[PDB]
């Protein structure tokens, strides 16, 4: 809620960022292999932004980003349902 | 010195080995350690990676994988276990420290592998002090000669390192499986002997370090 | 596997001058390459990281520029300690991989060799050998021609010389030579000489030494 | 609703992934002509992560991207709605 | 239509030597090459799938590289039951292609 | 054997001929069958792709399309119908089974077309033992030798595969639109005649397998 569903993301941000680089390192040819753009990627993941820079090639890579997806756009289907709450109680009041 | 491993191996051909890398320092969860190899007069080729902490290695794809990497968790150590070897496989090796953003940070001083069937030999250090009758120059040229010692290599210093001003120490040459080198120093006339100047030949590959002081000729 | 490709192999270049080393990637790779100095017999040591980024300890000389698949080491002026190989490494996408390298070499005023000769030790003798070594230090350039004699008469054997890679104090190069034979051989004789010719001097080098 | 807006989505994930190498498999330059990518492209295509991997270019091919995107995204607007309330509700009391 | 090209057309090697196949895509595939052996009148036989892992049943000599455009067979040894032609071909974007292969000799 | 097609066909000049392709194993609904073709001395030249269960099938973009391809969803047996040949239609056609992955794991034995006007010939098989005065050594070659047979292949064994080792078949010869080949076998002089020895030569154009033993010249 208030900033719960807001930890979790986080949680999962890290994690999936970890993760991945751990998946990804090893396959000849992946982009998604320092913990940096590793992270930046999950951002770009759990928000649907689908930007293009890095994605998985591994099959487990794949899985660590289908859970960012799913924790995340639900995290972020609660973060952006409260940011829209309190920043439109605030000029509503 | 951050990364640490051992001087020099000497291997059998067909026998095997096991290479070791203590890292003081951080021990960070996310660190990973790579294996840098580098044969004589080439370049740096990557061998592998390891992350300590979870476990995982991934090797080189194109390279004959000879190798197996490993860790001890709560030692702060890592190992590379190379198996069979064939003269091919002498070389310099390097351990790297990278913290996971990309480039090596710190690198270990490097482990020499000579794979023969040849016997360990530690060296003989004999001084070299300029001729009776030499006419001195304001600076005074001396060395001293390590002499039939396998395998490579031999730390050679002088006063055991005080005195780096002026030195060259030379490669060595090979000759019926024994080595041999010297070493060049210089110091100003005035000051020798009336200062007392020593080389000092650590061998790593058959653990002997050996003092030599370059005395006149008494 | 991404290849890196380092031209030129060698850079001549002229104390204090400025120095640019081409790295070409075979595809792009953004900024993700990072540079390191590898001197004679140490490890290597990273210079730039990210392209452009410098590293804290490093002298202000060096200057990491480019992007995309062309790549530049450069050193705003030069001097002797600089001299070293020097590699490139990607880290864009794996594996990691490593650069041909480039050694750096410097055109220097022209030097004449510091000849010294050295009798075989006292303790040497009691085994069963007597090698007499002769240092040529610090001369440039590298091409000089050593010469043996023993009592005048031009001995071509038991000679093993060595030369240093381009020492980086002064950028100059040495040389040494043992003389192998045996202790019986060595009391025979009486004279032993050693001559270079360089190019500095049309007039050989010359030394000297006489067990009698 | 509790898992069967989740199954219907994989359902469709499922036969999105087969029709796709059907449709795609025939027209020189496609992609999406291997069963496993084909999976793959159905989840970057349900959630609309739009990563830009693969994607189709037959017709056919598109009108199985159009299903995949309707009953995925109202799917995933009802797994993630679903998702939100148990593990919000859950760290809620 | 991707094209593989398998250069050179024939490899001379000796006994117990390390040898390597190339193969280079007209465009990037990633890793969806694999490699095929064919002996003299018998079919072809899968050796390599995407361009690394290995087939179960498959001498351990074969080891697959390479990611890209460029990629590698290689054999860690050679004995000669190994003289075939070997054949890439690319899974990556339709049709499925093939190399113009390369024979081993000893 | 898992793909498996006939041994070889022929086909008058402008006629049409269909290919067959029984598959045990496992039948799967996401299966594929492809079909390539290697003329003579040549590569693999895919020609088409068709899963039987569904049914499409799709064909090479860059050949001329001569063929169509066909499956029975209850037989697993699947279908090529090749349509007005000429003889650049004559070579090798293989089926391949892929599982939908991108390879082609299983392969068929490859059926044999020969595109001709000229008749089919069942061949003739002489046997081939040493003459009656050749010095035999520790080991014995003998052979048998298939003459005038038409269109190729024909399978050669040796005591029906039980003696597989030593053999060479020799590439066939043309003549007058018929071929000849032969096949070599050995032995060591010890075993034989104590151990008898027959070779089996299959033509499957012509449906005949025929027997010769390798007898001494009696």
Sequence with gaps: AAGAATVLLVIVLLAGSYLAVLAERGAPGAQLITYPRALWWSVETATTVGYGDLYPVTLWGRLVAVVVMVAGITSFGLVTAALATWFVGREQE | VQLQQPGAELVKPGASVKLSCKASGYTFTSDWIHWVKQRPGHGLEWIGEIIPSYGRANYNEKIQKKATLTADKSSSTAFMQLSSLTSEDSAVYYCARERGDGYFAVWGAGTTVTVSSAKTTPPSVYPLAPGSAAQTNSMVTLGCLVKGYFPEPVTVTWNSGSLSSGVHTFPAVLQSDLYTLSSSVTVPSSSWPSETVTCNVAHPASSTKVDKKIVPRD | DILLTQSPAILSVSPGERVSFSCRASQSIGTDIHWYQQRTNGSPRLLIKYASESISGIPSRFSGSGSGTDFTLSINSVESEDIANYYCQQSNRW??????????????????????????????????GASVVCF??????????????????????????????????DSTYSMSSTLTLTKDEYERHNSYTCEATHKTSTSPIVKSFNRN
Excluded at chain 3, 149 to 163: A, F, H, M, P, Y
């Design chain 3, 95 to 128: 594996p990691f991989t490593f650069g041909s390298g480039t050694k750096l070499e410097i055109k220097r005023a022209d030097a004449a060799p510091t000849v010294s000769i050295f009798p075989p030790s006292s303790e040497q003798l009691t085994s069963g």
């Design chain 3, 136 to 169: 040529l230090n610090n001369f440039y350039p590298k091409d000089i021609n050593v010469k043996w004699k023993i009592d005048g008469s031009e001995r071509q054997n038991g000679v093993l010389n060595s030369w240093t890679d381009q020492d980086s104090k």
